[PDB]
Amino acid sequence: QLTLTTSNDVFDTLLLKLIDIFNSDDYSLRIMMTLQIKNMAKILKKTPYQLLSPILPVLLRQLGKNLVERKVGFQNLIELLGYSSKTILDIFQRYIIPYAIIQYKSDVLSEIAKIMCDGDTSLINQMKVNLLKKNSRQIFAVALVKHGLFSLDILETLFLNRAPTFDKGYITAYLPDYKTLAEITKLYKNSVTKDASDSENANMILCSLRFLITNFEKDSKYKNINNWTDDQEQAFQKKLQDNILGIFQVFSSDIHDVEGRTTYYEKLRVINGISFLIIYAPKKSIISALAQISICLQTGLGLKEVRYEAFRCWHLLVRHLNDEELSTVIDSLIAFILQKWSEFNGKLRNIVYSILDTLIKEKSDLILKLKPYTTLALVGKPELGILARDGQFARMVNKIRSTTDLIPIFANNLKSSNKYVINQNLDDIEVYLRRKQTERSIDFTPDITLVLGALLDTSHKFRNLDKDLCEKCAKCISMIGVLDVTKHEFKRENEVYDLNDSVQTIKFLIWVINDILVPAFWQSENPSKQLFVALVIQESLKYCGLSSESWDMNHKELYPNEAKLWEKFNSVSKTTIYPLLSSLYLAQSWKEYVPLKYPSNNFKEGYKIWVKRFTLDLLKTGTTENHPLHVFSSLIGSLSNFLLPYISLDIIIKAEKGTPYADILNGIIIEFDSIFTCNLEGMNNLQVDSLRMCYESIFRVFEYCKKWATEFKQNYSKLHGTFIIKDTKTTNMLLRIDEFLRTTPSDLLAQRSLETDSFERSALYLEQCYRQNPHDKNQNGQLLKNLQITYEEIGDIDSLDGVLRTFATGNLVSKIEELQYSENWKLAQDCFNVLGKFSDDPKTTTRMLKSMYDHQLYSQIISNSSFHSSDGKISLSPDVKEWYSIGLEAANLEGNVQTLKNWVEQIESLRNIDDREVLLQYNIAKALIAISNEDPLRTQKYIHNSFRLIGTNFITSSKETTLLKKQNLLMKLHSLYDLSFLSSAKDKFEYKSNTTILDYRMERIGADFVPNHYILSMRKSFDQLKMNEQADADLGKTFFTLAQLARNNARLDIASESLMHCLERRLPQAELEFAEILWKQGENDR
């Protein structure tokens, strides 16, 4: 129970103190310790194996000394663990062989052979030679380090004393491996302090570090620093620059253990090795190591038992580095501390105090001058008390709360990957936005649309992970509210593209590396893929092949060409990839053809391997050591599509081909026709979103060949284009568009275009098949009706109107949906309510309730007895559940107690609730009855449930929506938050304050009638729910104001039916503007 109160360092040391006094061979001690360790394991809910496996590499390491003697102690240890001896031996042989080989000569290696092969003495020699063939690098580490012997002859002595099969003298010198350097760098066996023993074996591991190929077989001793000369370091510097990438890619492979039987002791010595190598490396090496060293210690941070060492390795990372770089990897600091402080003991609390006061001590240029989000986050949680710690920076943070254009950097840093920093970003959004709401002066200038679109498409992205993040992002954009389109926009190809001209290929490739480096190559996972990253940026600088023989920034200065190529080179890229200008990594000779023209994998897989073979075929026929496109063979799940557009521009090269280019063109186009044959097969998501996304991606490269074809005609007409033929390559251009203009299965092409989002070009490839067809024809009508449903998708109601009035004249009940939006909705509405009045047909009754909804006859919706009867509504809500889903919202925005109460408690009696919108409006209604019962915490519970629903099920992305289409979401969420925080009100001072900033909301709404009406009618519904007397004053004035906007938008029957409730409560100004609606209409006299 003393160990039960201990965290990682003390915990491990005391576990060692448990098991050694267990191995103090007292019988009572033995049995009591076994009992206590088993109970401790089960109350920690672990097996004793994984419980002690953090220290089992430390524990039986010394049992490897006296394993000829302590067979009984090792036997008690293995029967404690419950496994066999070999089951732990094969996995923890990494740490006994160190002190089994280099020790005294009467080896326990014979006994580890005796256990390693138990049933057979078949060949102990091959048992020896294959476990040393697996693990012979490690004895290079121990023999050069753990006792410092250098001589290759005594190395061969310790080989062939026990390894007679170790032939040819010394077998192949794999000792210059990056894995060999990554395992030799692992003896920063430090302490909380620095011993003289720690100093001398630190200099020893420095000597074994610097011992490499310069005197590999040429040995000097390298047991002393004196032979470290002032000449050999630079070749050592560039050689170590070649090492370091493979080194911490080996580290990344180590800590991302797919085996998962190992422990974090390897992770802790990895943290030791990283700390050591950043102690001992120059500026060039420590900045060539920038990107996924951070991700490696993010993996270290995530684990429950390697915190404190990773925090102090943060701390020495802060020690040994300046502030010009290092911006890109320190968001993790403030994210982890601001999102996870509530666990932390006094140890982690005061060392993170050391972190933060270091950061404000020497790195103020990075903190308060470069990344002001770090400042605003650290002071936006003053709960940690940093102003109380230092205080002198209060004037500086007061100035920085003023001096930030903070919205675009919100939009920047919110585009991260892991949950913590973006959760912190939107938490900053939450507190900053409620602060701007209180101070009444948030700027909606003609931008805030950037940060709300960033929130929108992140919530689009998190549709399958962290519903809590979706909920909090939803309430963040509820706080941002509406942001009407009426004076505002929604921000969302780059440049004309070719292949010939040198400076445009330079601009093209620098845009390429700008697109692919900073999101994707600052966070990858595969170590071979980050080696591929280094390879592709290396060959990019081979194409702009300077700074490898004579050029440096202003050290060389001798030509302004790379000065221009470096000033146009972006400053973020200038930071992140300047130490890789002397990259020395070389690829491998590429493999066979791996043949093609399979439609089966094109059907069942597509983007998995068929689109990959597609890319690899057309590149291995494409360039063949002529372009950077040759090297991209080793990226082949986002590594595709974009590349997939730009890979397929290789058509220009021929007029007479003599080559398989048109062969592979016709082949991939008939593979696309094999895709085109597919019609959904009666199959689940494995068809109907996977092959759909295949359609979308190949559709994307289709619209790229559209885009590049037209911009690749425009680029040769920028200066002039009347030279048209350009010596037969224009004929090749029109040959490309000839193939692509014969490649139109316009039925199926437009069909899948309409089936995916693709609204406007789906309409356009309906337009061209309205061009090329018989005009009076049978095939027109389906491409009229799906065109009008995609114009329901397009949201342009008057485009819908022109379509319904331009030869869409089937039935009269199909032709009376035009006055619906042609200013005469009343005749349309009572036509639909006499249509659907028999309440049996699905279509007429659904359009009855919907058309009745769409011009705000909401009292008639709620009084409509399609649900009201001698009982409630229809149990087991059928396929026309959209009757309900259009009725509950009207019941919300015009509410009472009893009808809302009994009707949503009718609709709860469903067994399942499959529609998203009925559950949305259900939960906002149950929040309304909860505050009828006056319980604001349960009210907020259901409001946050509704936040969860929209964040998980409603939200679509950017690039696709002028937010007219988003208004149905952001309207309801603005109303919901406005309901929410004054549901969470206390007294009348708070209440009038809430209504005053609701008047600010009514300022920032603009004058869009349907959201105006919706929000303040929801306010009206709530303060007629609340029978408080200032709620009644607020009721009367909001009745008055919606009568005002109804007068302003000239539908003054709803102005009357609202304005009555303040006429009868003695408002003479409401009398006067009742008089003005009467004066407006026809009624001068009264």
Next chain:
Amino acid sequence: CFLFICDLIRIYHHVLKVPIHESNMNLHVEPQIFQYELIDYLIISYSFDLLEGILRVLQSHPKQTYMEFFDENILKSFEFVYKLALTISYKPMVNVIFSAVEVVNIITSIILNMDNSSDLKSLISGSWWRDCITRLYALLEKEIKSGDVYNENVDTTTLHMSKYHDFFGLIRNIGDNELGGLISKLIYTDRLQSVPRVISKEDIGFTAPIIGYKMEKWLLKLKDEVLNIFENLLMIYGDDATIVNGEMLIHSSKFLSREQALMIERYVGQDSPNLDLRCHLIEHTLTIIYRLWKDHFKQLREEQIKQVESQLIMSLWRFLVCQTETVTANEREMRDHRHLVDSLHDLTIKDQASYYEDAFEDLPEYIEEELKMQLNKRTGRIMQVKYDEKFQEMARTILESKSFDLTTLEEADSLYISMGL
């Protein structure tokens, strides 16, 4: 009726098969309905309660008249619903676990109390046994902690009696019945209907964790019943079989050791009413160890005793440490110690002496003489020193006994010095 309830529960199939964890996107957005859940929770619970009732009235039917009830379909249907009940990959309803183990109790009890057990055990395949016993072991290797009974937590370790099924039941009154008013409000009571009246699911739900203590009392009686039917099946198979196979050294020894160790660490001085039954669990599973040792040594394999060599001998030593007798020795300070830890039994015995016992008035100075012995030995048995000498002797005659080399003589004195001796 019995086979009807068995295939009735395999009709109502998905209730005891809700998965361990929800998805990351298994949203708790929901209409928060409770009425269908209440319907089928009552269906399942009352069904298993009826199974228990059928088998106790069948037990009350005489000891000649069982073959009319019993055939293979009985055992097959109950074997399916038993694997359905004591689930592994699904969320367990504790209610039906009570019933399902009480069924097996009635089964093994009438197997003991009939003369023609041979026809019944010949009807029984040993697969039915060794599929029951694994779920019994996995049940007994769970824990009982008051502060997270009514919390929803990690599975398969905390018999936790979920908030959304909390009523009494047909035989026993297992909870508080927070849901009884909701059973009343299941119907509109002024109307003829079939659709349920509304129950919003989270209107249910800080005053007293005595609810937690009595639920602990139920669960301690439950684990008592588990080891009780272990005892019963050992007395069935006095002879050795597939299931009298040594694992009731391992699992029962693990239970005994843990409920002694963290008894001493955690409970003595926690003054909950459950302490006495929690330390009666160890008192009874000591005998479960003991007669398994003495009368069933023939199957007790050499490997499995070494699988449990630490905990068995240590559990025996935690009774052999109590032969020192250096705490009690008197009357005076012991009643101070029972003020310290056993004031709850003082409340109990004052309420019994004041209201609910005929013999507890006008005490003639021979019968409170019994009390000033038995409360004191009871509070010693709570305080983990001074068990009964017969239990100390039973723990002695396993470790000292030469049926197996538990210790050597040069290792046993290393334990005798840990008392003195």
